[PDB]
Symmetry: D2
Amino acid sequence: MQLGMIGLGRMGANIVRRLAKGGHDCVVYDHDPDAVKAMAGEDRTTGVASLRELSQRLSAPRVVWVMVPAGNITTAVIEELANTLEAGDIVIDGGNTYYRDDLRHEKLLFKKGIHLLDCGTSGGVWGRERGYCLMIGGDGDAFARAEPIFATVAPGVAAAPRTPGRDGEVAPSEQGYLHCGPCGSGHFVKMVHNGIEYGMMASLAEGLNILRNADVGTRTAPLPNPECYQYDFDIPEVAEVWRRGSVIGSWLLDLTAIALRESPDLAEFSGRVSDSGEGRWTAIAAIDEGVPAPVLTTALQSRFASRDLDDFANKALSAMRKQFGGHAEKPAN
Amino acid sequence: MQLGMIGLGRMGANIVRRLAKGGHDCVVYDHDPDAVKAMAGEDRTTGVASLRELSQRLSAPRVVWVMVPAGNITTAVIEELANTLEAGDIVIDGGNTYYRDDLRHEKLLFKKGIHLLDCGTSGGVWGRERGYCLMIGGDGDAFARAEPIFATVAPGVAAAPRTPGRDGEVAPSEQGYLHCGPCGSGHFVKMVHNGIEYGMMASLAEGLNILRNADVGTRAPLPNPECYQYDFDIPEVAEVWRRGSVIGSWLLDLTAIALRESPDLAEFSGRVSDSGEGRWTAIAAIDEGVPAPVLTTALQSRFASRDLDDFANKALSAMRKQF
Amino acid sequence: MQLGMIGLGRMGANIVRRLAKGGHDCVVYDHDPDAVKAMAGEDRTTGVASLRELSQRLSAPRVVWVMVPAGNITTAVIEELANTLEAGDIVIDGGNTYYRDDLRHEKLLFKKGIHLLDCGTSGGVWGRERGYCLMIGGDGDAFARAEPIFATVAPGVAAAPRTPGRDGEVAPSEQGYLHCGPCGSGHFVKMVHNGIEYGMMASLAEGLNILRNADVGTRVTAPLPNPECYQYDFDIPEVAEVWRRGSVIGSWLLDLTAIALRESPDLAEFSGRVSDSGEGRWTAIAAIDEGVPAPVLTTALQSRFASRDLDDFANKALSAMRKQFGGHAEK
Amino acid sequence: LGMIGLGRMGANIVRRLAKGGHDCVVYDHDPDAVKAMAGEDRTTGVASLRELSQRLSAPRVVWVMVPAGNITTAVIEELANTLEAGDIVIDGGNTYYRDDLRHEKLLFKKGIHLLDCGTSGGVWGRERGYCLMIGGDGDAFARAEPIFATVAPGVAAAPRTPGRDGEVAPSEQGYLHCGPCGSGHFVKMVHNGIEYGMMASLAEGLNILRNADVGTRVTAPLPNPECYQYDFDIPEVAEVWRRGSVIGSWLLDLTAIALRESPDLAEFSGRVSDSGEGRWTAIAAIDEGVPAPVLTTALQSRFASRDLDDFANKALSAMRKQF
């Protein structure tokens, strides 16, 4: 069927290509018209430069997909589409929008008789060929109507064997997309998906670091039994070995195996790690719900400390440690 | 070829049967016949009730596998082999041995001609068919001798596409087994493997829990009850995350299976054991000055699920009564 | 000076009595005329039957202290205090209100020209005799205008020896009260006060549990290597006592800790389920927006959750994975 | 009794001991030390371990506070040959409570006793007294208890515990025989654990406040920047908490001092060392199955402050690039 895409970033673009390859008619716009002409070249690029233009070259009922930066710019666009589109149309925001914002947007465009489908999109660069895991919330009927687009841009059941106990017909979840519930529920689930992302990468990273320093007995606190810690491990080969037959098999380990093999010491990488903030929201939801989430919240708190956001607290320790114990801050290595 | 196998549990037995279909000769023995007895002439399988019957049964170099419950049972076996095994024969300890105990086991054997390869065995109860990831330490020539076994138990490179940039011939690492270094290093890596495993499990456990309670507004005051109105179908989220997402993993796959069998996991108590490798990994982290909150917090969650925080909760309760 | 106090729970009733004995004239209102009546006999105090009559008896400009259940009850009192009060009068919110909620109350009262003093009140029951540590956000003149009352409710610098490094005419902070900043500052600092309180509680508690089970080698799942290293039966109440002078971990909480362990050495009668206020939750939310790592504070909050079994589905999911990949049973 | 080594701790003990009234004979590896003995008041030095050993009677009691590690152990093995039987050695160093068990065995071989001592209070100990936790023999302790009460702060240091009626017990004094060998050091270890957690708590809260103005200074895109526009007088917030609230504590008063001297705490870099007893507290929790996230994460915050998270961060950065 026929679809419009506002925003052609590394992700906006790879969905219109994966869709054009899947047999759908795509229309598109990004403010920068060197990126709007980039696609014009491809199958069903159908480039365009107007919101009105767009609403024009698409026939209602129509479905438009939005992937522009979260925050003001997104809402800005929904604002317009409140005009530019007719009633009974459909709005898919696949941006990294906060689920509480999806509730205002659903409000606004309901007045104009548009439906908002909120699509939590994950996958990265691989998704144009692999496909994206989509987590969608919104009105039940408008999901039915746009379901062909999700089914095409999800990886599809072929991507992984069926789970044992899965019976007969293929359910959408097995395809890689899911109506997670009403409005906002798609971004909500994707939010928690990124929180789990953090927890898994920290578990890999901390482990790697334990292995890395198992030689501490070769080389202040006295170390009892330094005869015990005398190992120099091959971190690239342990990472690779764990990829088959173990319990921690995962994409992230696969990725870590690659990275360790290019750089065995990760020497050129920054010790400064950022967070998306979706990880922030996942931690705040957990607090709001009384759900203890130390593993995910500490993984996120380890990123903050990696940006020296623990600065003042550290000085307070050294300040306390000085006044009770004359304790000295040791010089930098 | 040939080898011995002391212990025939869920693991020891199943590696024997994957060892056998691989063309190896096994000599099964478990302190219980009902177990040994349990294996009724499984291809390439013969049962003895003698460590002695066991040793002399096969050719030098005399070497074999022990899969007995970790602790003094492992040690208590590892003294008997002292009294047997001749010399030049290497003991393969595939059990969940604390690597520090590996050091005492190896020297005790050094007072003889016996070699010791400590093998951290992974893969659980999927391993008969899937294969077991293995991390072994001890001597490189002793490892070289037993290498044909390690390749057969392991999953083989075919179990996963090769790493981008892996060119030429398959390395040990690629086939699912790896010689990690001197004695103890095998069980040391796998100890850390279980540490990482606790933190992956907990990462997705906590996440599902956040989702499961997103319907909080419908049922410590909560502002914005209108922001917590969702009744998520956890079995479906778990299987959507299998394809096209960052967090794919074998653990997610197994979590998906279990939610399909039981959408509320009602059968499970929530009282979670820990076998020790997670704790040893946390101690190693602490002695190395490596901060590991994410892994250690996951261990501590398992303690709490067993009500081991109870005395502290009592102290908290008793403090607030005062003010 | 003259003051209004709305509601009379133990907190609200005691601020009233700490004030009227400090030489302040108190006019009290409550939902419950029973509660209003208990304040009729008290020196310098007077009851009311409606907010209209409350302000009839306070000479504008008036200062009204609200001490009521946080949330929807607080908002309602304030909303009609917009009608009962004229321009330039001030409303002190001493209740346990969310600082973000103070933002909508300030705007809703300025529309009618009422200043909103937000006041975070700590210390509990001993405050009636020892004073409440006070933290006040809002307008600086309104604060200066109502400062005689904050001063009187506070403990007073007698309560603690002065700080080495301070000398002179006593600053407001050494009174036990302080002007934190614009509206919401007082509840903001007071919510972090509780977060720290949870942090210290927890540290003691974990500490004592570590002592409690040093005898773990005697009694005998993970093999405990080196069992001989854990063969101690510790006198926990004496250990807490000894720490009370000469250590670094001296604190009012350790003092209460020592008391509690003296009455009951095994805390046998006490609950293992620990509830949480909500400010501790506000604190942890604040830390995450700010990008401030607070594992200690937050992990103390999260321990509270797990003690009310709120960790349960997570636990079931761990066990479900364990049976899938290992055939592990639950004991 | 004498004192071996004279650091900030070992010396201000014997300055407090003598003013108290007993006589101590002083020693050290470095004679360049010995700023004492001016008198030393009630104090006279020595130039050899040997010289001191044949000194001050045969009721031998000597107190060691030299840095822990192997420098300790050498002293005790030397002090074994140089003390005669019946004399017991007090160890007030930060010794792993397990180190004491070989030493106390080492010493009763030749009839010398040991008493573990957990010595706290630091640069305030002289005028404020040093809280001591002592492990060992019940009679050896009793003979030395004169030393401990003049070393400790004295019951006067704080009001008696409400509900403690009757006569003074040693704990109110500031000292206590915690139990057998190693127990004295075990308690000071946990004290140090709790301390890390108590100041991390305050430290974290102060950091929270310090950054309550992130809505002005403008990583995630912050929602509700209006909710975070506060500049707090951190040295006054510190002060006001000292009266009338729950977090009253000595660590706060010292934090209120430092902030009055240094409003932004510039003279401290952020690099926080850890003497080791925090680590053993955490390891004891993990051996006992006691969950101690608050204390174990306070210590991990120190680790990260020394950049020991480094490789894990490089790891997370290398993973993100792969997306």
